[PDB]
Amino acid sequence: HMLRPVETPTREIKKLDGLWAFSLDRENCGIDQRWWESALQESRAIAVPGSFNDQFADADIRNYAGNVWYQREVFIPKGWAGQRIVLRFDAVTHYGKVWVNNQEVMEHQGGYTPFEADVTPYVIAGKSVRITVCVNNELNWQTIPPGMVITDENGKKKQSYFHDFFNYAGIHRSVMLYTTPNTWVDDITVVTHVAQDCNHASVDWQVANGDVSVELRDADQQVVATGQGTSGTLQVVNPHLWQPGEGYLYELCVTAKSQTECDIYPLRVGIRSVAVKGEQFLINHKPFYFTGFGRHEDADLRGKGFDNVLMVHDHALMDWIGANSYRTSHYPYAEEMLDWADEHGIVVIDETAAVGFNLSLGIGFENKPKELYSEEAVNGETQQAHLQAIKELIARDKNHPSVVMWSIANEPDTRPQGAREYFAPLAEATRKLDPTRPITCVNVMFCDAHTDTISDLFDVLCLNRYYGWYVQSGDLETAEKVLEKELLAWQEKLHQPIIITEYGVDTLAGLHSMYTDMWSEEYQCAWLDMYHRVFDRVSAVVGEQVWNFADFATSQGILRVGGNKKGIFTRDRKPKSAAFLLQKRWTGMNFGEKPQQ
C-alpha cells in the first residue's frame, strides 16, 4: 500500500536537495567491511537525483557494473517527536539497500518504482542520522528488464542487455523523509463510472486504524459529495468530465479520524470512462485518436535523473507539436510526469520495464541461451518478478486519470511456444489487478500477423513497425505496400484497435539529401508522411506514436551513431525538420479525432 506524499497533517523534508558522498566498489568489499558503519572513504560529491554514469565524464564510472555507495548525513527535524516518519525512495535504478545509521531498513529490486520504510524506532528526532545506500546496476534473467553479466578473465564485470537505451543507474529520482500522524491514510482506490456524460458516480475503497469520511471538493473547492466507510462507496454525481483536451480534476479528500488525532489525504480525481469496443478506443464513450510519442527519461549529463526544467520544456514542445498522448517507453516514468498528465489531460499508455524479452533484435557478427523461454533464460522466477513489476506499477498509478492503458511488455519474441505460456498468466493477473483499464503488449516487427502468438490475450494491439528502415531500406514504394498489407492483416485477424506505438527513422540533424535517402532530414519527413497516408486508410488504426521524441543514449555499437537518432528533437531539444511536419498534421486535425483522409 503506497501513496504519493503531500501536505498538512503530513510533511516532507526531502534529501533530494543536494550532493551525496559517492564511491565505487571494484572488488565488492563494501558489504564485508560494512561501509554503512562509518562515513565513507574515497568519497566524491555526486548530485541526487541523477544517474552516476554521465556525471564525471569518465568512461570507467560510466561503464561500471557492480555496487556503488551513496551516503549523506541529515538533521531529523525536531517538531517530529510525536508523528510517524517514513523514508521514501522514489526510484533507485535496479537495486538498492539502505542503512539508517547501522540499521538496514529497506531493500528493493526494481529501478523505476518507489519504496519506503517507516523509520520511527531507528532515529532520534531533533538530531542527525547518517543514510547509506548500496546501489546495484546489474541485470540477470530474473530482473525486469533482463540482462546478462559478463565477467572477463580479470573479474571486470561488463553488463550486456537486450534493449536499446543505455543502462543508466543510480538514484534517479526523489529521496525524502515524510511524516504522517500515527493514524493515517495508507492506500486509496478510486473508480469512475459515466453513462450519458452528465450522470455518474465515483466508487471508492480506502485503507489504517482510522474511521474515514471523504469529501469530493470542486476545482472551486465547493463540496458536492460526501461518504464514510473504510470499505468505500459510490458517490453519485452530475459532473464535468475529465476530457483529453482539458483534463478537469475534482479533488477527493479522505479524512482518517481516530478519536484523538486525525490525518487527511488529498487525492485528485478525473471523472472519465475508458473502454474498448470493436476497433475503437473510447474515453467517455467517444472514439479517441492517439497522437504523440514514445519518450525516454534521458537527457544530457543527468542520464535518467528527473529534472523539473526538462519536464516543463518537453511538455511545452509536445503541446506545441500537437501531441495528445504518450507512452512511458520501457519503464515507469517519474510520477511528476503522470501528475502533469492529469492536470493537462494528456492520455498516457503506462508501461512496465519488461523490455528485452527477445534475443533476435541484435547487431551482427558476435553465446546466448538458445531457448528464450526455458530454465536458463526467461523462466518461472522471471514470471514472478514480472508479475511483481506489474503489481508495483499498478499500485502506484491506479488512480491517475491520465493513465488510460497498461503495457505489460515491449517487443517480446512471441514465436516460440512458451511465449504464450509465459504471458497468458500475466495477462490474466493484470486484468484482475485492474479491471477498469484495457491491457496491451507492444509487438515487434518480425512477429507478423501470421506468426504472432499472444496478441489475442490483450485488448489493444500496439505495433512497432519499421518498414522502409530495417527492411526494404530506402524503399518507400515497397515499404508502403508491406505496411498496408500487414495492417489490414492485423485488423482482419483481431478486429482490435491498432495503435502504432513505434514508427521512426534515424536522422542526423543537418544531414540533407536531394535524394530521399536514409539518415537525412528529407527521408525522415517522407517516411513519416508515407506511414501517415497508410494509417489514414485503415479503419482500425486509432493511434500513432512516432518512435522517439528526442535522441537518446544507447550502448555502443555499429547501429548507433552516438545513440539512437530517431528523435524528432535532438538530445538538447532542437527540432529536426520533421517536427514541423508533425506540427502540421497534429494541429491541423480535429482534436482527438482520426484524420478524415
Ligand X SMILES: CCCCCC[C@@H]1NC[C@@H](O)[C@H](O)[C@H]1C(=O)O
Which positions are annotated as active-site residues? 411, 502
| Residue 470 binds ligand X (CB under 6 A) | yes
Question: CA 279, CA 285: separation in Å to the nearest integer?
Answer: 13
Q: Specify burial of residue 515 (Cβ count, 10 A radius: 0-12, 13-18, 19+).
A: exposed
User: How many beta carbons lie within 10 A of that of residue 259, not counting itself?
Assistant: 8
Choose from ligand X, a second copy, none: what does 470 bind? Cβ within 5-8 Å by kind: ligand X
Among 512, 529, 537, 584, binds a second copy (CB under 8 A): 512
Choose from a second copy, ligand X, none: what does 445 bind? Cβ within 5-8 Å by kind: ligand X
CA 454 to chain centre: 22
DSSP E strands in 298-432: the ranges are 325-327, 347-351, 403-410
Q: Specify burial of residue 41 (Cβ count, 10 A radius: 0-12, 13-18, 19+).
A: exposed
User: How many beta carbons lie within 10 A of that of residue 584, not counting itself?
Assistant: 12
| Residue 514 binds a second copy (CB under 8 A) | yes
Question: CA 545, CA 528: separation in Å to the nearest integer?
Answer: 11
Paired strand residues for 117: 87
| Residue 519 binds ligand X (CB under 6 A) | no
| Residue 445 binds ligand X (CB under 6 A) | yes
Binding flags for ligand X, 233-262, as an x/- string (CB under 6 A): ------------------------------
* DSSP conformation letters of 37-80: SSPPSS-EEEESSEESSSTT--HHHHT--SEEEEEEEEE--TT-
Q: How many residues does the chain have?
A: 597
- Which is nearer to a second copy, 566 or 573 (by Cβ)? 573
- The answer to whether residues 113 and 92 touch, using CB atoms and an 8 Å cutoff, is no
Whose CA is closest to 330, among 162, 469, 528? 162
- Which is nearer to a second copy, 362 or 562 (by Cβ)? 562
Cβ at position 426, least distance to ligand X in Å: 19
Q: Which three cell numbers mark 181?
A: 500522524
Q: Specify burial of residue 278 (Cβ count, 10 A radius: 0-12, 13-18, 19+).
A: exposed
Choose from a second copy, ligand X, none: what does 368 bind? Cβ within 5-8 Å by kind: none
Cβ at position 290, least distance to ligand X in Å: 18
Cβ at position 13, least distance to ligand X in Å: 37
Sequence-ordered alpha helix ranges (H) in 277-379: 308-321, 335-344
| Residue 184 binds ligand X (CB under 6 A) | no
Among 4, 15, 465, 576, binds a second copy (CB under 8 A): 576
- What is the footprint of ligand X within residues 188-217 (CB under 6 A)? none
Cβ at position 486, least distance to ligand X in Å: 13
Cβ at position 7, least distance to a second copy in Å: 35
Q: Specify burial of residue 390 (Cβ count, 10 A radius: 0-12, 13-18, 19+).
A: buried
Choose from a second copy, ligand X, none: what does 577 bind? Cβ within 5-8 Å by kind: a second copy
| Residue 167 binds ligand X (CB under 6 A) | no
Dihedral sign computed on CA atoms, order 554, 556, 562, 566: negative
Among 206, 464, 501, 507, binds ligand X (CB under 6 A): 464
The phi, psi pair for 391, rounded to 5°, reads -70, -40
- Which is nearer to ligand X, 75 or 470 (by Cβ)? 470
Cβ at position 317, least distance to a second copy in Å: 7
Choose from ligand X, a second copy, none: what does 574 bind? Cβ within 5-8 Å by kind: a second copy
- Which is nearer to a second copy, 318 or 405 (by Cβ)? 318
Cβ at position 409, least distance to ligand X in Å: 11
Question: CA 335, CA 131: separation in Å to the nearest integer?
Answer: 24
Binding flags for ligand X, 307-346, as an x/- string (CB under 6 A): -----------------------x----------------
Choose from ligand X, a second copy, none: what does 103 bind? Cβ within 5-8 Å by kind: none
Question: CA 374, CA 313: separation in Å to the nearest integer?
Answer: 44
* Residue 408: DSSP 8-state: E
Whose CA is closest to 225, among 258, 253, 264? 253
- Which is nearer to a second copy, 421 or 517 (by Cβ)? 517
Among 509, 518, 530, 538, binds a second copy (CB under 8 A): 509
- Which is nearer to ligand X, 330 or 396 (by Cβ)? 330
- Which is nearer to ligand X, 113 or 564 (by Cβ)? 564
CA distances from 328 to 163, 279, 334 (A): 15, 23, 9
- Cα end-to-end distance, the chain, whole Å: 47
- Of all residues in the shown chain, the one whose CB is closest to ligand X is 164
Among 228, 513, 556, 587, binds a second copy (CB under 8 A): 513
Stretch that binds ligand X, among 22-30, 425-433, 462-470, 515-523 (CB under 6 A): 462-470
- Which is nearer to ligand X, 117 or 445 (by Cβ)? 445
| Residue 530 binds a second copy (CB under 8 A) | no
Question: CA 306, CA 298: separation in Å to the nearest integer?
Answer: 9
Among 90, 116, 164, 544, binds ligand X (CB under 6 A): 164
- What is the footprint of ligand X within residues 354-413 (CB under 6 A)? 361, 411
Question: CA 104, CA 459: separation in Å to the nearest integer?
Answer: 43
Whose CA is closest to 89, among 151, 7, 2? 2
Could you tell me how many residues of this chain bind ligand X (CB under 6 A)? 13
- Chain residues binding a second copy by CB under 8 A are 317, 320, 508-514, 521-522, 570, 573-577
- Chain residues binding ligand X by CB under 6 A are 164, 330, 361, 411, 444-446, 464, 466, 470, 502, 564, 566
